[PDB]
Amino acid sequence: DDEFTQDLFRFLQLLCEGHNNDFQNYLRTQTGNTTTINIIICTVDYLLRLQESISDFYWYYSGKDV
Amino acid sequence: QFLRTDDEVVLQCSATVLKEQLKLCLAAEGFGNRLCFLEPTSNAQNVPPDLAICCFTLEQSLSVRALQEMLANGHRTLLYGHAILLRHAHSRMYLSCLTTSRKLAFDVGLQEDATGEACWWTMHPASKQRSEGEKVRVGDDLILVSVSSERYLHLSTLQVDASFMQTLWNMNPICSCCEEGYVTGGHV
């Protein structure tokens, strides 16, 4: 059920719209917090597992043509 | 850094024989005995390794269901979680999970043909820091699972066999894509 991932990454995009450098850099590390957490490397991790799922899903249909 | 198709490697693994430590390598003789036998190499300065049969070539690597098509029919980097076709440096039999036993799990050994599931071996890293579809790296620890028997490659205590138990297996490079001409070690 993808609608939530839609809302969430639309969320993270909307946090950065208007070219907010300070907030993008904030996402990259958020310096003030006790634990740095890089949303970008997470997001890329998601994009990664998601292609992996897409590719396997391609091998489900790579033979099937139609 | 990256392992690739046609990157010759030995399957070394840790073993604390004699109260630590005996590093040792998988190495089927090929012509004469299909069964693999362990080949300790820790001695280095003492008895020299039989490295000539230790070696294996990664002739192919594929996604696990990418495998499951050509079977029903470029030096790409190994990714974790891909199945890969191991192949002996000498006899050039592909490595496989032989359907034999010595006391449940099957013996490992070479097979004449690239065909038929057993020759393939999926790579499952033990470290959680690594993830499926990440590029495999030099000297990284990793489990090898037979695609056919669904058994882990294993250091039974000592002889190799496929087993339900896991064992770590270093993919130590021997060589990559060496330049034309130019002598390298391990050549006759």
Added chain:
Amino acid sequence: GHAIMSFYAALIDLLGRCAEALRIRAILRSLLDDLVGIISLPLQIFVPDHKASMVLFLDRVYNQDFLLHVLVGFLPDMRAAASLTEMALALNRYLC
């Protein structure tokens, strides 16, 4: 007590209910490897279930001479006379 044997029976039954997927049959043949369990369970005439699992397993996971070797339901046929009883119920489980 015999409940461990009921566990092994439940297990071999659960593996008796499993048959791309050709390889898994080899995974189950890896555990016939049975055979002796049907003979030991017939010699121990409890009885119906343990062997029923072995037989369902032997049917699904697994030649006519070999079928001749599996003769022993005649034991159970002797058990049918025993009704004249818990063991009688067992025979029913064997007719299936």
Added chain:
Amino acid sequence: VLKKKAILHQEGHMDDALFLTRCQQEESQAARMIHSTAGLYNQFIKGLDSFSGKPRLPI
């Protein structure tokens, strides 16, 4: 279990790396406070034991 015990050794496989993470101020204060606290109350207790069998102390 989960006690992956550590000892010093000549080699060590690659995932051995230990990336660092800062403790909170409050928490390390709490912990050092645990050291001072245990280190006072224990000797308090050992001092209580001295006269438990001896009818006749940090305080």
